[PDB]
C-alpha cells in the first residue's frame, strides 16, 4: 500500500539551516531582492524522509534496524518541473518499489514522489539493506514501472513477430501497424517463490501509437500473466526490438572536470536537526558501539548533499535548476573530521544533458561515495549562417569522419543524381567550371521533366508573366550545360544546397553525439532558416530540403533581367551608420534610403538589419546604390546631422534640403554606363558576387510559384507544432513562432496573402 506523508511548507529559515548544515553556498538558495529563493534538490529528503523511511517499518519487512545500511539515494526531477521554491506546499507519497531476499540479507527499494499544486515535481529513490538470513519469500515482491519502450514497425516481419506474442492485445485485431511508432508504458509486478525464480510475473499497461499530429492514442494493452518463471519476456522482447526514447551516448574520452576536497563536520548534530534523521548511530558513541560501527559515522545523506553541492558548483556552473538527476551509491562509512577527495568526470550526454560520474575517496584512497548526475546544458539558441564563404571542400572533413554527416550527404547526393542528374558532393569537392546534365534513357527523361517543371513569375511591362526556368530545355533536348567563370560552387543554385547540407550535417553530427538540448531555441539568417527548420523541427526530409533550396537558388538566379555576359543592374551594399557619423542612427539611414527611393524613382531598400547602428545591407537598383553611397560619402564630409536638424532646427526642411543632395548624387550616378561598378565608399562596402536584390519587395512577384513548390515538398503531417511553437524565430516577423490570431495578423500585415486573410476572418471556426 502507498504511504502518505504530511504537507511540508518550505520556509526561508529551513533552507538556510539546511544549506549551512551541508555547506552548499549556491546563490540560488540565499535571499536576494526581486527573485524567489529556491530550495536545493537535496532538501527533498528533508520533506520525504518521514514517508520514505516509514517503508522499512511494517511487520512483514522484519529487520534489525541497528544493522540497517543505506545503500543508495537518488533524486530525479520530472521533465519540465521547475525546482522547489520557498512558499511551495509540497505533498510526499512513497511506495515500496521492491523488497527482495538476497543471500546476504533483504534489500528494500522505496520511491518517494514529491508533488506541489497536484502536479508531481520529483522522485526520491532509496535502497535500504537489512543484513541477515531472510527466507520470508511470501512477503517479497518487485512492483516496477518500466521505462517507456518505442518500436518503429518498418517491415511486415516486425508485424508478424508482434502478432505472435499473445500478450500484444490490440483493441482492433485488424489495425494497420505498418510505418507506425508504438510506445509501451508497462508496469511489471513480480512475486517470488525462491531467490532465483518468480512465483508470479505480470507485465501490463497501454500500447500507444503516434498519430500524424505527434499525439499518442491508446490502441491496445500489454496483458502478460505467468506463474513460475525465470524472467519477464515482455521487457526482454522490448529491450532487444525497441528503444527507450533517450540514448546515453558516451564521449570518446572522459573529461576530468575537477578533483575537489570536502571535510565531514566534527559532529553530526547540525545535519540531524535539519534533516530529521535522529538515528542514534550518527550522534551517540554507545549506540554506534552497539551497532559494531567504527564510531559515530557521518550521515550518508550529508556526504551525498556535500558532493552534490560540488557537482552543482563545478558542472552546473552554480545554477541549481540545471541539476535534473543525482544518484549516489554509499560504499563505505565516513567518520567525522575526514578529508574526502571527489574526482568528478564528464562521461557522456543524454539528449542534450551532461552525464557526470564522480567518485569520493578518503585519506586512505578508499572509494566511499560513487554516483552519477545529469546536468541540463545552459539555455541554448542555434543560429544558422546564411550565404557567405562557399570554400571548395566545405563540410568534407566532417563527411570523412561522421556517420550522420555521411547519411545527410549521401541521401542528398543520391536524390540530386536521381532528380536533377548531378552529384552535389562532386560540385562541393572538385568545383567544376562547367557541368553538363544529360537526359538520355528512362532516367534522363524523368530528369528532363523535373527541369521543364521549374517555373518563375516576373513583371514584363506591368504584367505578371509565368516564363520557365531553363527556357532552352524542351521535350527534344538531350543535354543542358551549367556555365560559370571560376567555378559552379560560386553560382547561387549550387552554393545554397551545399551550404544548407553543410549546416544540416554539422547539426545531425551534434545530435548523434547527444549535444542538442530538447527545448533549445533557434533562428537562421536568410537561407540559414531552411537548414535550421530541417535541423531542429524535421519539417522537411533532406530530399525535400535540398530540392527547395535548389529551386530557391534558381528563382534568385533568374529573378532579374541580365545582359549577354550575365551581369544585372541590381546589387547590395553593407552600410555601417556608425562610421559616417556617431550621431547617424538607424531611423536616420532608413529616412535617407526611403527619400533616395521616392525621389530618383529607382528601387533601394534595407534588406538586412544585422547589428543596431553598425551593420545594415541595402539592396536595390545598382544606380540607387551609387546615389546612397555618394549621399553618405557627402554627409560624412560636411559633418551635418539630419536627426538634430529635423527636430531642434526646423520642420520638413531636411526633406527639401536632403533632396538637393540626392539630385547632386543622382545626376552624377545616371551619367556613367548601366553596368556601373560600385565604389567602396566611406560608409558603404559593395557585397561582391550578388546581382539579385532579394529580401526586397522586388521579389514579391516571384513568391507564388516558390510557394506552390514549398506546398508540394512540405507536408502538414510532418509539421510538428511542439517543435516550432516558441522555439523557431522567423526572419519575416522576428517573433517566436506561435499558432495564435495575433501572430497570423502580424504575418498578414507584412505579406498580404489570402490563405492567411481567410484564417484571420475564420479564426473562431478553427477554434471549434
Amino acid at each position: 500500500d502507498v504511504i502518505k506523508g504530511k504537507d511540508f511548507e518550505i520556509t526561508a529559515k529551513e533552507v538556510y539551516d539546511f544549506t549551512h548544515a551541508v555547506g552548499n553556498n549556491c546563490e540560488d538558495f540565499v535571499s536576494r531582492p526581486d527573485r524567489t529563493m529556491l530550495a536545493p534538490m537535496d532538501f527533498a529528503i528533508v520533506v520525504g524522509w518521514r514517508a520514505i523511511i516509514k517503508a522499512i517499518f511494517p511487520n512483514t519487512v522484519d529487520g534489525d534496524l541497528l544493522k540497517l545500511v543505506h545503500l543508495s539515494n537518488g533524486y530525479k526531477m520530472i521533465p519540465g518541473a521547475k525546482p522547489l521554491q520557498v512558499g511551495d506546499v509540497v505533498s510526499t507519497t512513497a511506495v515500496i518499489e521492491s523488497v527482495v531476499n538476497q543471500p546476504t540479507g533483504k534489500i528494500v527499494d522505496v520511491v518517494g514522489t514529491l508533488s506541489r499544486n497536484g502536479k508531481p515535481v520529483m522522485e526520491v529513490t532509496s535502497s535500504f539493506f537489512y543484513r541477515g538470513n531472510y527466507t520470508d519469500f511470501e512477503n517479497t515482491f518487485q512492483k516496477t514501472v518500466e521505462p517507456v519502450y518505442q518500436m518503429h514497425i518498418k517491415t511486415s516481419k516486425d508485424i508478424a513477430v508482434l502478432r505472435s506474442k499473445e500478450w500484444f492485445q490490440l483493441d482492433d485485431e485488424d489495425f494497420d501497424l505498418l510505418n507506425k511508432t508504438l510506445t509501451f508504458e508497462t508496469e511489471t509486478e513480480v512475486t517470488f517463490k525462491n531467490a532465483n525464480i518468480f512465483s508470479s510475473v505480470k507485465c501490463f499497461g497501454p500500447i500507444k501509437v503516434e498519430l500524424p499530429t505527434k499525439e499518442t492514442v491508446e490502441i491496445g494493452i500489454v496483458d502478460y500473466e505467468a506463474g513460475a518463471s525465470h524472467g519477464n519476456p515482455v521487457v526482454d522482447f522490448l529491450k532487444r526490438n525497441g528503444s527507450t526514447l533517450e540514448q546515453k551516448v558516451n564521449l570518446e574520452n572522459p573529461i576530468p572536470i575537477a578533483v575537489l576536497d570536502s571535510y565531514t563536520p566534527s559532529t553530526n548534530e547540525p545535519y540531524a536537526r535539519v534533516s530529521g534523521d535522529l538515528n542514534p548511530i550518527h550522534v551517540s558513541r554507545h549506540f554506534a558501539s552497539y551497532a559494531n560501527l567504527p564510531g559515530t559515522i557521518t550521515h550518508g545523506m550529508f556526504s551525498s548533499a556535500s558532493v552534490r553541492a560540488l557537482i552543482e558548483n563545478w558542472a552546473a556552473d552554480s545554477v541549481s535548476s540545471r541539476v535534473r538527476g543525482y544518484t549516489c551509491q554509499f560504499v563505505d562509512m565516513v567518520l567525522p573530521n575526514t578529508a574526502l577527495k571527489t574526482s568528478i568526470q564528464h562521461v557522456g550526454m543524454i539528449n542534450g544533458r551532461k552525464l557526470i560520474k564522480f567518485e569520493t575517496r578518503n585519506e586512505d584512497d578508499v572509494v566511499v561515495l560513487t554516483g552519477e548526475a545529469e546536468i541540463e546544458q545552459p539555455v541554448t539558441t542555434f543560429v544558422f549562417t546564411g550565404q557567405g564563404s562557399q570554400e571548395q571542400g566545405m563540410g568534407m572533413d566532417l563527411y570523412k569522419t561522421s556517420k550522420a554527416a555521411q547519411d545527410v550527404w549521401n541521401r542528398a547526393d543520391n536524390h540530386f543524381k536521381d532528380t536533377y542528374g548531378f552529384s552535389i558532393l562532386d560540385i562541393v569537392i572538385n568545383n567544376p567550371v562547367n557541368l553538363t546534365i544529360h537526359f538520355g534513357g528512362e532516367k534522363g527523361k524523368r530528369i528532363r521533366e523535373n527541369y521543364s517543371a521549374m517555373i518563375f513569375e516576373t513583371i514584363v511591362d506591368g504584367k505578371l508573366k509565368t516564363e520557365k526556368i531553363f527556357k532552352e530545355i524542351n521535350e527534344h533536348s538531350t543535354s543542358y550545360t551549367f556555365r560559370s567563370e571560376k567555378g559552379l560552387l560560386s553560382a547561387t543554385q549550387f552554393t545554397q544546397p551545399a551550404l544548407t547540407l553543410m549546416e544540416k550535417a554539422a547539426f545531425e553530427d551534434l545530435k548523434s553525439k547527444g549535444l542538442i538540448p530538447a527545448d533549445a531555441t533557434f533562428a537562421g539568417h536568410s537561407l540559414g532558416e531552411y537548414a535550421a527548420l530541417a535541423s531542429l523541427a524535421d519539417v522537411m526530409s533532406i530530399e525535400s530540403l535540398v530540392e527547395v533550396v535548389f529551386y530557391r537558388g534558381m528563382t534568385m538566379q533568374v529573378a532579374v533581367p541580365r545582359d549577354e555576359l550575365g551581369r544585372s543592374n541590381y546589387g547590395m551594399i553593407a552600410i555601417n551608420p556608425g562610421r559616417v557619423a556617431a550621431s547617424f542612427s538607424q531611423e536616420a539611414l532608413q529616412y535617407v534610403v526611403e527619400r533616395v527611393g521616392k525621389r530618383t524613382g529607382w528601387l533601394v531598400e534595407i534588406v538586412n538589419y544585422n547589428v543596431e547602428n553598425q551593420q545594415y545591407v541595402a539592396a536595390g537598383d545598382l544606380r540607387a546604390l551609387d546615389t546612397v553611397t555618394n549621399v553618405l560619402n557627402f554627409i560624412k564630409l560636411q559633418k551635418i546631422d539630419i536627426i538634430e536638424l529635423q527636430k531642434s532646427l526646423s520642420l520638413e526642411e531636411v526633406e527639401g534640403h536632403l533632396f538637393e543632395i540626392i539630385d547632386e548624387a543622382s545626376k552624377k550616378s545616371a551619367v556613367k554606363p548601366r553596368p556601373l561598378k560600385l565604389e567602396r565608399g566611406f560608409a558603404c562596402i559593395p557585397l561582391v558576387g550578388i546581382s539579385v536584390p532579394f529580401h526586397s519587395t522586388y521579389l514579391m512577384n516571384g513568391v507564388k510559384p516558390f510557394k506552390s513548390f514549398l506546398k508540394k515538398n512540405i507536408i502538414k503531417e510532418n509539421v510538428k507544432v511542439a517543435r516550432l511553437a516558441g522555439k523557431y524565430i522567423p526572419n519575416l516577423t522576428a517573433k517566436p513562432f506561435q499558432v495564435t490570431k495575433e501572430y497570423f495578423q502580424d504575418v498578414y500585415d507584412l505579406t498580404g496573402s489570402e490563405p492567411i486573410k481567410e484564417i484571420i476572418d475564420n479564426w473562431e471556426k478553427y477554434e471549434q
Binding site: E215, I255, T380, F384, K707, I729
Partner: protein, 94 residues
C-alpha cells in the same frame, strides 16, 4: 483548438513564412533582441562555415547588453561550430 487543426494551421503559417521570407527584409536585429533578452540565452551556438552571426551577437552584446548582463549576472558564451568545435563537442586536449 484540436491538435489536428493546430497542425494544418502551423503548416499553412510556416509555408507562408518561408515563401515570403525572400520577399521581405531579414529582421536579425529584432531576432537577436528576442533570443538575447526575451529568452536570456547563455549559449549562442552558430552553425556555418564562418563565424558571422557569432561576430554579430558579440557586437550586439557589447553595444546594448553590458548593463542588462551585469544586472542579471549571467555569462553569455558565443560559440561557432567551425572555430570552437572543441567547446561544443567536449573534445579537449590532454
Amino acid at each position: 483548438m484540436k491538435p489536428e487543426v493546430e497542425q494544418e494551421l502551423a503548416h499553412i503559417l510556416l509555408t507562408e513564412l518561408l515563401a515570403y521570407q525572400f520577399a521581405s527584409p531579414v529582421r536579425w536585429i529584432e531576432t537577436q533582441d528576442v533570443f538575447l533578452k526575451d529568452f536570456n540565452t547563455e549559449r549562442v551556438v552558430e552553425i556555418g562555415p564562418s563565424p558571422t552571426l557569432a561576430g554579430m551577437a558579440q557586437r550586439t552584446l557589447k553595444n546594448k547588453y553590458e548593463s542588462y548582463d551585469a544586472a542579471l549576472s549571467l555569462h553569455r558564451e558565443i560559440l561557432c561550430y567551425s572555430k570552437d568545435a572543441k567547446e561544443i563537442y567536449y573534445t579537449p586536449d590532454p
